[PDB]
Design a protein around this nucleic acid. Structure first.
Lengths: 77, 73, 76, 73, 73, 76, 78, 73
DNA sequence: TGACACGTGCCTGGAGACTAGGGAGTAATCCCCTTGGCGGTTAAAACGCGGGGGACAGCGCGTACGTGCGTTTAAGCGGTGCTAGAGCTGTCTACGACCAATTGAGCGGCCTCGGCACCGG
DNA sequence: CCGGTGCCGAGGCCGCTCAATTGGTCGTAGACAGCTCTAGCACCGCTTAAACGCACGTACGCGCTGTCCCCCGCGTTTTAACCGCCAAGGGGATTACTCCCTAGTCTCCAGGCACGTGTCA
């Protein structure tokens, strides 16, 4: 249940996107906030991989492709 | 380096391992990075709106929780 | 522009209403029956479209039931 | 006949044509019928509940609209 | 203060006492608050939908009863 | 006779209603708020006794959050 | 995963016996498709019950399923 | 022999394997048999009621489907 | 009256039961630090009187507004027999692309400090 | 009208897994064919959408009434937050153990079939 993405790169990326949305104005991020955001992104990516692997096993192939994730996203909506 | 590249290939591989996948194409990493960026963009946008609505300079955990609620189911 | 015949779908909708109302048969307005039939049509069409997205992905031309089932599983 | 069987095979074929599918397996019709029944069951259950809330004996178009809203996205 | 914290720790402890539990971890309170919020969200959403169906501006006891029926068993 | 206070739960229910009404807040009939609070407290009590069934079977005496989570998973 | 795990003839025998028990001596013709559907459903319910009971067994230190691990699962589920 | 014993130990073991369990206590088989019997009793009772409602002497697949619907979720 | 289920009979591989081997998860115990439960306290949010104001639910009634029906029909539509051909699936193959493993090392996480940004009692 | 909380940047250490390179191999897209199944042509039944009347249950809008929602004060009130002491226990480690995992073999049977027989709306 631990994070598999290291906390500092993900913190960098999150702060970068918050910078983009705020025209560069820096809104400080609490530790629990970044922790929850990383938890949610991790869970979302894991569920997307379980869906893309459902696609892959439906296609008979054993390896994910750039296609099985795009199709999982398209079908999920 | 680019800041999106700090989420290295072994991290995506480990997330995929937790997703139960046995083999991984080389291009998936790039696609996954794009997907993740999109997700983060959306969530963070909502979080910041909540923060600006409260007229504060600190993104709290509750802001993130509200963003997640309003973004995913 | 209804693809399913009107009266059979009316029969089925009233059957299910009798199921859920425990014996009491509600008067079904014609507007309600058409709205319900249009919604069911659109839902089935979208499900077929997603199932064909699955089947073409799996290197086939005929959609089997297992991919309608997989589409339903993915959509949630 | 059974009442679910009134939704004939050519009707399912036509719906499938509108969905853009070119070829259709023989078992899909039966499976589709089951799926449709499930959908209808859910929607009609909600519609009838709304009808009971409105203290009416006639399911109205508004009942169906609310059922559909609260059932599908 | 945030509004979810108004359901104080001793209230959750008392509910737990009624549930027959003798000892309570510090984190349960936070988790319970999340669970309760989820429950309320669902029930209130259904209640408000019923209210809109009745073309009323006041949520009635019957709205809540119907929401509870359609939400929990 | 309810354990949770009337006014905090009232305020929380009103906030959650505003969430789902796009900012317009409906007047809550006091009986409706009372019924909702009764239902919420009964659900919480039942969840707690299920979680204690789980924790007693795990050899422990103190309730944990994972106990409630597993109870929620098993129930549905 | 789809193939039936229980032998068809003993389960059909048990289904017919339980059918006899309820009507008190009336033998109903049991359509073979009804037997197949009932067996599919019974096996699915059993598999799901074992899944939840193993979720309960994982909670405690043990790795082996017990009777109480199923009894408590049935009590919690309903 | 008793009729419940025709569901042999390896069959219950195979069902348990499909349920993802790695190790199995000796008493579970007996308990499981009881559980299954209870389930069957309920389902078959409902199926037979439907059969009597349909004024038939042959239990049909639809009778079983309706029994299962009205018994489990 | 015609399609559908129940009891006999064979047999052949497919499966159920036993014990030989054993080891590894199951059961009982100690203490160490953690961390809930309880004694004191006060005030700060809760909760009933009480005026008060009224927006709005609930009920009654009229009216036409849409439901269900008797009966047709015919004509577009459904069930079906037969057919030609296009795809599913079983199988061979071979080669680009993956997984395991080790080695230099480069960035994360903990440790700590200087600096300010800021809604707020 | 200043203040406690928290982030950003920096100095600096470990640490541990990151990237690359090797080998092994594998599994999958293309090709090829038997099968099969299916979309369509053509016939004949069929049954359904709309049209007539026809009566009629009742949905909805309008109006009247009360009635409880929202509001605040406010006296009380009582118990939540906090702190500190007492002690129950979660669990990690330790030691024993026993009973269920493999599994080959002797033995029972699932069912595929082939048949005869009785049954019901």
């Amino acid at each position: 249940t631990h994070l598999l993405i290291r906390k500092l790169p993900f913190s960098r990326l999150a702060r970068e996107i918050c910078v983009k949305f705020t025209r560069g104005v820096d809104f400080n991020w609490q530790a629990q906030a970044l922790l929850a955001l990383q938890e949610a992104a991790e869970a979302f990516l894991v569920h997307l991989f379980e869906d893309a692997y459902l696609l892959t096993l439906h296609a008979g192939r054993v390896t994910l492709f750039p296609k099985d994730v795009q199709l999982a996203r398209r079908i999920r909506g | 380096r680019d800041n999106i590249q700090g989420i290295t290939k072994p991290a995506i591989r480990r997330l995929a391992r937790r997703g139960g996948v046995k083999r991984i194409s080389g291009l998936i990493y790039e696609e996954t990075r794009g997907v993740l960026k999109v997700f983060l963009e959306n969530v963070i946008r909502d979080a910041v709106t909540y923060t600006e609505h409260a007229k504060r300079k600190t993104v709290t955990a509750m802001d993130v929780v509200y963003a997640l609620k309003r973004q995913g189911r």
